[PDB]
Design a protein around this motif. Sequence first.
Motif, PDB file in Angstrom:
ATOM      1  N   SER A   1      -2.760   2.322 -99.864  1.00 54.80           N
ATOM      2  CA  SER A   1      -2.963   1.924 -98.575  1.00 54.80           C
ATOM      3  C   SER A   1      -2.412   2.737 -97.221  1.00 54.80           C
ATOM      4  O   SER A   1      -1.974   3.896 -97.488  1.00 54.80           O
ATOM      5  CB  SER A   1      -2.215   0.336 -98.319  1.00 54.80           C
ATOM      6  N   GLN A   2      -2.189   2.111 -95.966  1.00 53.28           N
ATOM      7  CA  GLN A   2      -1.846   3.006 -94.946  1.00 53.28           C
ATOM      8  C   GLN A   2      -0.677   2.430 -94.151  1.00 53.28           C
ATOM      9  O   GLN A   2      -0.145   3.100 -93.437  1.00 53.28           O
ATOM     10  CB  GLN A   2      -2.965   2.822 -93.810  1.00 53.28           C
ATOM     11  N   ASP A   3      -0.161   1.037 -94.323  1.00 59.33           N
ATOM     12  CA  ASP A   3       1.066   0.450 -93.851  1.00 59.33           C
ATOM     13  C   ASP A   3       0.938   0.444 -92.381  1.00 59.33           C
ATOM     14  O   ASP A   3      -0.099  -0.161 -91.862  1.00 59.33           O
ATOM     15  CB  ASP A   3       2.386   1.312 -94.453  1.00 59.33           C
ATOM     16  N   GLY A   4       1.568   1.086 -91.618  1.00 56.09           N
ATOM     17  CA  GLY A   4       1.655   1.033 -90.193  1.00 56.09           C
ATOM     18  C   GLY A   4       2.122   2.065 -89.346  1.00 56.09           C
ATOM     19  O   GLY A   4       3.046   2.160 -88.417  1.00 56.09           O
ATOM     20  N   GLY A   5       1.208   3.209 -89.536  1.00 52.53           N
ATOM     21  CA  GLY A   5       1.783   4.607 -89.193  1.00 52.53           C
ATOM     22  C   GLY A   5       1.497   5.646 -89.911  1.00 52.53           C
ATOM     23  O   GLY A   5       1.676   5.678 -90.948  1.00 52.53           O
ATOM     24  N   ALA A   6       1.239   6.809 -89.494  1.00 48.83           N
ATOM     25  CA  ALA A   6       1.167   8.218 -90.290  1.00 48.83           C
ATOM     26  C   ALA A   6       2.243   9.203 -89.965  1.00 48.83           C
ATOM     27  O   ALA A   6       2.041   9.834 -88.825  1.00 48.83           O
ATOM     28  CB  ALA A   6      -0.267   8.765 -90.141  1.00 48.83           C
ATOM     29  N   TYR A   7       3.476   9.040 -90.685  1.00 49.51           N
ATOM     30  CA  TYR A   7       4.408   9.845 -90.390  1.00 49.51           C
ATOM     31  C   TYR A   7       4.467  10.954 -91.734  1.00 49.51           C
ATOM     32  O   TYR A   7       3.618  10.792 -92.523  1.00 49.51           O
ATOM     33  CB  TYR A   7       5.812   9.129 -90.818  1.00 49.51           C
TER      34      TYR A   7
END
Lengths: 552, 142, 87
Positions: B5-11
């Motif tokens: 998935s992607q969760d909440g942000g691309a760190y």
Amino acid sequence: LGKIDEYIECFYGETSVEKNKGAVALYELSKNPQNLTQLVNNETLMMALARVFREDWKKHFEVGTNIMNLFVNISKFSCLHGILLHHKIGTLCVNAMEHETKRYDFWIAEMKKTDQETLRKLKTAIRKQAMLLAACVTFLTNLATDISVELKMVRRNLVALLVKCLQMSSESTSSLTTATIKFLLKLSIFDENKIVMEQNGTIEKLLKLFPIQDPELRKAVIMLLFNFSFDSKNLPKMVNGGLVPHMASLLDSDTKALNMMYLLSCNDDAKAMLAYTDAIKLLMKDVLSGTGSEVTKAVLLNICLEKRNAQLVCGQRGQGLDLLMEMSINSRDLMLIKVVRAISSHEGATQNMFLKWIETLIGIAKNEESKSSFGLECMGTVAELKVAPWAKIIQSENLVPWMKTQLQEGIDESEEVTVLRDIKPLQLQIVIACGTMARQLDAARLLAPLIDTFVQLLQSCQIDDEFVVQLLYVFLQFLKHKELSARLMTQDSALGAHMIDLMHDANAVVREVCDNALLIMGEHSKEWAKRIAGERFKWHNAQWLEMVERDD
Amino acid sequence: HHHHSQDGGAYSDERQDLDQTIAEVSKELKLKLLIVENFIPRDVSERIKERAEWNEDSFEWNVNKRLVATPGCRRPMSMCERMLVETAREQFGAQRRPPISGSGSFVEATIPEETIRFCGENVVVFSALERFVPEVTDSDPS
Amino acid sequence: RQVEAMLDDIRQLRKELLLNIAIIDEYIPVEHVELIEKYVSWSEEHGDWQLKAIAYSAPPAKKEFSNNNQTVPMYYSYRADLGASTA
């Protein structure tokens, strides 16, 4: 009178019966008042009587009751009280009660470790001592008609002795109980006697007497409790003490029972207890039969403030209050219309009972000092209802022109001179009815041409918090309707500015309803929410704003 | 085996850049927490935090009668009404009590007009206490 | 166990930060937050911010209405009506 010296010589005889025979003969001679002056003026007689009461009395209750009832017969007339006080007769009864109290305590502590014959002996001795103490306290009560000698006796420990005498006969009620309770009733007129009385726990000892069969003891106890109940503390002590249930049955028997029951019903817990008593049908018997009373209608008004009592008065389908309202309207009884308004104050299925009297009560309230009071009571009865159609009544009864005429009467006067007007309470009932009516959409659209009148009245009448609270409640009932919500939510709404000013008021309820309207005004308008939040933040961190302005 | 998935942000996944992001978000959280503390009252903060719903799929919070009266009376009575009632009670407290030695058997217990017109309850006002009368007379021989 | 705590810290801190940002956006307006933004000082050696804080009295009581219409004086007194002590 033919053998008085013979009775005196019998008193000089050292025999238990030779003394008491002459004593009972002297008592039956004193039974008539003709020679009472001749015997009270006999010096050698009363001196020997007091001396034989001092000497032969500890072991002889057979003579100390006769020679005490003789003193009571002498004290039946107040012109002989000086001849009695010239002797040390009054101290004799005080010493007798002081000794017999401790003797009764010793006997009650001896009964728990004794055989059976001595037990009956102690029972008979306690009964004879009760008769003697009853005669003595009755003599002191007749002497106490002079308040001077009453204070002189109260100087000596008296009220404690009377509480002890009441505790003695508290189990087996006798003449001692009735006499000591009458004396406590007479003493309760003053404050110091009442303090010494209730400090020794008199109210609970009286409450532990009911039920009592003797009518005299019943009247004396209820009157003493009536004297006690004019303190703020003694009423809860009686309500929690169970006085209410066994007093509710006495409403049909005694006369002071209603007087005490009213003072009890002034408390809420007493109304909750009377909710399950027969007396609710007794009052309705006396009110409807025409042989009513002002105390009866007053206690009925205080009783109907409980929901269960109003449901009982209403009957099962409406026939209960259909008679009460008919007697209230035809005879113009203000107390009965007060009871009807108290019944209508309750919320629930009981308001459907009032559905048939809407138009008649409005007509009474429109054209009617007692007439204005009856119209105010009818307007308050109509205002308490919210299950009514209202949308039909508001036009079939032409309520709008009449409300606009009444609310505008007295406008633009500055509250200083016009807030104490006779018309003012009717305006409050009209505002309350508009708030209870505007919750329905049809009634709100019918009341719409009154919004400008409400705004003028809100800008005018401000000294009383309650009028402002009810007016803001009417506005809150208007704001919830979508059809007329935007009509009041203009960017420069006078109602919105007034609520922003009232947001920081001393009364908590006014700011509660003000927030209850402001969070609706900000829900459908983002800019109004920003202005409300800015007003809220400038009243809590304003010290920081001021200190940073001083820093700059 | 597992999906993604992607969760909440691309760190990023570096050992130092994530530490810098932690330091920055903590530095901003300190300021936001103190601003919540000193300015917002406990009541408003407790109400908003109790009426807030955290989202799992997304990274966001979602923050979604009866007639009243004056602090004394049961029913809503106006100010002129209660003021007249208070002055009437002062008049009732200014009354003179009956004499100790006088014929006052009749308690009566009248209902004042001042209470029947304004007060909705406790209308009866008693005049005097009950007082027992001894059976005594000043009549000599009959 | 490669990079789990390093992102779990970011997740918890961002959750707390979003909660605080939501409540401050709910309460204080858009201009006052900008005003507060220019009156605070971060500290690298303390690990916190600083501002001019103070407080952030009370009425005594209110004379609530009473329904005790029974205000007629009734009890007498030996020490007041008869002028003599009861001791």
